[PDB]
Design a protein around this ligand. Structure first.
Ligand SMILES: OC[C@H]1O[C@H](O[C@@H]2[C@@H](O)[C@@H](O)O[C@H](CO)[C@H]2O)[C@H](O)[C@@H](O)[C@@H]1O
Length: 504
């Protein structure tokens, strides 16, 4: 995966509302800034309950958005990342509809998992109780095959039926997705919900050996088509290091909340700790299309005794710090959970989570770009967007607070702001300076300061980070100094907004 900054965006929420318009905005307004892009699900349909992650036909672009040729067109300039939903598919798909009509006579009957598929011999209470769950209840719902009532395995919603990833039809389906991705010259594949993709009795059915056997089989099938794979997994941070050592690339879900903590308090030990242990085969982010994950830093869900990178109280304070900085907007968006250790995510834009503080925000991006891994910037964050209460009150969907529809007018208006111009100049710096293709090193004091250093062939750069120097939502004190060496010798920048860095 190229070591340049990528953009995460919906096709219809960045420009006129299509892949062509998205590609236009990308090329015209962000040349040299984002040379790659993760296009969020654009299949048939894209405007369902789960905003593209519940497609009926994974193989077909939503004709309202464009076509696969638009993807191929965009590939001539930008590396493209796309989601591959491997765990499940729509019950409205023709494959599953056929199983309902024809039952065991159906061509696709082996393609879908049932309780019998995994538990031919009966299941105990411990068998079903130990299954890892992202959603409440048991992962089963009622469907009638021909006329016989059956318990179909469903990890998320009853409308998304899990497929047998070891069956021929299920695998044939996954390869139809891969073949279309490779046909349109997609570079990277984000394997959605792959952690649940393998079921075996007696296990949690989440990241078991059979799961790593599936990821490796999908890897080899991908390279055979020129496709690199990436796994998305939210879990306890020690499981994250375990997983990252067995796969090609993972997400760094710990950093976003860790930077919210450090910018809220000033304590940099948790960040220095994470820097030392984190997997470096990662994709770094601050915001995503979902809420801010706090589970990731992050007591274990099943066994509270395993403590995260900060005490449970600092996790509670982090959730409440977001509620305060947004003045209750994220409360309206986040459904209460009685306690904050029971929260998965907090719904708010990352800019608003910082109280819209420019100095704090640019610093967070700077740290993101200076840690090993390929950085991504979510489109709302690329525009330093605030929470969208109107869409939230229209759709009643919590995550829409961080999914604003940006017309080309709104993009060019927000492009006039200095914080936006600083981020663009920062990504260009991150892409243009060849120091980042070299070797990484870091130093720390104790709690006040931490310095991130990259030294390459023709260039060097160091980022020092002192959140102590400026505390408060309304504090304008720069908390990140930058020094770097290039063709024009040694240079410095003590303010990354007013004095954004440039390369020779
Ligand atoms: O389709 C449901 C969601 O899938 C992805 O997010 C999941 C996350 O919410 C949690 O359940 O963990 C799993 C496995 O790590 C994630 O796949 C999408 O990112 C999300 O947008 C979908 O709603």
């Amino acid at each position: 995966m190229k070591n340049k900054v990528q953009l995460i965006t919906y096709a219809d929420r960045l420009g006129d509302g299509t892949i062509k318009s998205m590609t236009d905005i990308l090329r015209t307004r962000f040349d040299g800034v984002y040379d790659g892009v993760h296009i969020l699900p654009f299949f048939t349909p894209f405007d369902g309950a789960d905003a593209g992650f519940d497609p009926i036909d994974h193989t077909k672009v939503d004709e309202r958005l464009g076509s696969w040729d638009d993807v191929a067109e965009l590939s001539k300039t930008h590396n493209i990342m796309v989601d591959a939903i491997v765990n499940h598919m729509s019950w409205e798909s023709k494959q599953f509809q056929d199983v309902l009509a024809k039952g065991e006579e159906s061509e696709y009957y082996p393609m879908f998992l049932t309780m019998s598929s995994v538990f031919p011999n009966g299941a105990t209470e411990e068998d079903l109780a130990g299954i890892y769950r992202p959603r409440p209840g048991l992962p089963f719902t009622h469907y009638k095959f021909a006329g016989k009532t059956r318990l179909v395995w469903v990890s998320f919603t009853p409308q998304q039926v899990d497929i047998d990833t070891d069956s021929d039809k299920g695998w044939e389906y996954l390869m139809s997705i891969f073949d279309q991705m490779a046909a349109s010259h997609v570079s990277y594949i984000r394997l959605n919900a792959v952690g649940y993709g393998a079921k075996e009795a007696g296990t949690s059915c989440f990241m078991t050996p059979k799961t790593f056997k599936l990821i490796s089989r999908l890897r080899e099938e991908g390279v055979k088509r020129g496709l690199e794979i990436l796994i998305e997994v939210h879990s306890y941070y020690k499981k994250q290091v375990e997983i990252a050592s067995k796969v090609d690339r993972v997400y760094d879900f710990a950093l976003p909340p860790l930077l919210l903590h450090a910018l809220s308090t000033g304590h940099v030990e948790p960040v220095a700790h994470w820097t030392d242990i984190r997997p470096n085969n990662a994709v770094t982010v601050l915001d995503t299309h979902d809420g801010i994950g706090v589970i990731d830093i992050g007591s274990d869900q099943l066994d509270r005794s395993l403590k995260g990178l900060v005490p449970d109280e600092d996790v509670d304070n982090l959730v409440n710090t977001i509620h305060a900085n947004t003045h209750g907007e994220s409360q309206a968006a986040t459904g209460a959970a009685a306690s904050n250790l029971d929260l998965y995510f907090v719904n708010s834009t990352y800019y608003s989570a910082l109280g819209c503080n420019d100095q704090h925000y640019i610093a967070a991006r700077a740290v993101q770009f200076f840690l090993p891994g390929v950085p991504q910037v979510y489109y709302v964050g690329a525009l330093a967007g605030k929470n969208d209460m109107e869409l939230l009150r229209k759709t009643n969907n919590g995550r829409d607070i961080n999914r604003h529809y940006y017309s080309t007018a709104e993009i060019d208006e927000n492009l006039k702001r200095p914080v936006v111009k600083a981020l663009n100049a920062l990504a260009k710096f991150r892409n243009e300076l060849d120091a980042f293709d070299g070797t990484f090193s870091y130093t720390t004091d104790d709690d006040t300061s931490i310095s991130f250093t990259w030294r390459g062939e023709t260039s060097q750069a160091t980022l020092t980070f002192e959140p102590k120097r400026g505390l408060g939502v309304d504090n304008t004190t720069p908390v990140a100094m930058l020094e770097w060496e290039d063709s024009a010798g040694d240079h410095r920048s003590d303010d990354l907004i007013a004095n954004p860095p440039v390369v020779a």
